[PDB]
Design an enzyme around this catalytic site. Structure first.
Site: not given
Ligand code: CA
Lengths: 56, 250
Positions: B41, B90, B182, B186, B188-189
């Site tokens: 994504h 994803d 959590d 930013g 992500s990945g």
């Protein structure tokens, strides 16, 4: 020994074989010790180890 | 990362920062000298693929200390089953234009075998997630790399506790439902990494959630074990012209 229980005793990867046979294996950059279960690095920067912590 | 701590420099040496036109895009994980795993994504809105750069050895975004290594991204490979704008499948595999040099500050994370990951790693409770993402929901991003220890849930338990997209077999939940801790936008990945008998392994990718640290909700991560064979086959294949490649999954 079977690979679904306790990882077959292996430090890394485990293969079940025909009979009561089990073979442990290691990731690239590691070799298997004569105990048949432990892996030791063969390169300076093996995957998944943190150099500054391995030095201390 | 919300509610974590600064990762001491060099203690997350597989962490990747992805930049487009110099701006922070996403995180990633080094798994070999030319291969990085990230989230599909992250690439939904890229107009010119030649502006995508991966940085290894990064820690503090405000200073250059000389341990950083930047590489152009030569290929972004996404599973055929991934649909832009959605959450399932994803994952992306990136080939660097030139190898990074392994150093004390740049080391790959181990991509585990599928069986080992499913039979053993999947039952290790706590794992580490890291990134330079938002430090709060609706908040500024981190200048120093952050890290957080999160517990993994079985998907039945995640659904029973969550109080929306489905949690599929290509995902898992991890974290806390009390609003304290959590991964966030930013991040992500970036890696969800699991320690087992002295070695760290890639088990997840920061993917999605409801806001960040939202009460009654957990972070959701790509279940990397579903993609090991897919990834291994791609890493054994010759490069193809054109940055973006859609590759059949399974
Ligand atoms: Ca820096």
């Amino acid at each position: 020994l079977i690979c679904v229980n306790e990882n077959g005793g292996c430090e890394q990867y485990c293969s079940d074989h025909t009979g009561t046979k089990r073979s442990c294996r290691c990731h690239e950059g590691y070799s298997l010790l004569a105990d048949g279960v432990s892996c030791t690095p063969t390169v300076e920067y093996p995957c998944g180890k943190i150099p500054i912590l391995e030095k201390r | 990362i919300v509610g974590g701590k600064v990762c001491p420099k060099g203690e997350c040496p597989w962490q990747v920062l992805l930049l487009v036109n110099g701006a922070q895009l996403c995180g990633g994980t080094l798994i070999n000298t030319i291969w990085v795993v990230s989230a599909a994504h992250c690439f939904d809105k890229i107009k010119n693929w030649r502006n995508l750069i991966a940085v290894l050895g990064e820690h503090d975004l405000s200073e250059h200390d000389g341990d950083e290594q930047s590489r152009r991204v030569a290929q972004v490979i996404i599973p055929s089953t991934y649909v832009p704008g959605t959450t399932n499948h994803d994952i992306a595999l990136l080939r660097l234009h030139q190898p990074v040099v392994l150093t004390d500050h740049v080391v790959p994370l181990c991509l585990p075998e599928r069986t080992f990951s499913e039979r053993t790693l999947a039952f290790v409770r706590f794992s580490l997630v890291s990134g330079w993402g938002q430090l709060l929901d609706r908040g500024a991003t981190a200048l120093e790399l952050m890290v957080l220890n999160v517990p993994r849930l079985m998907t039945q338990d995640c659904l029973q506790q969550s109080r929306s997209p489905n949690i599929t077999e290509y995902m898992f939940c991890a974290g806390y439902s009390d609003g304290s801790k959590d991964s966030c936008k930013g991040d992500s990945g970036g890696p969800h990494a699991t320690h087992y008998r002295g070695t760290w392994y890639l088990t997840g990718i920061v993917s999605w959630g409801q806001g960040c640290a939202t009460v009654g909700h957990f972070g959701v991560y790509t279940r990397v074990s579903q993609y090991i064979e897919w990834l291994q086959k791609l890493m054994r294949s010759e490069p193809r012209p054109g940055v973006l490649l859609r590759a059949p999954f399974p």
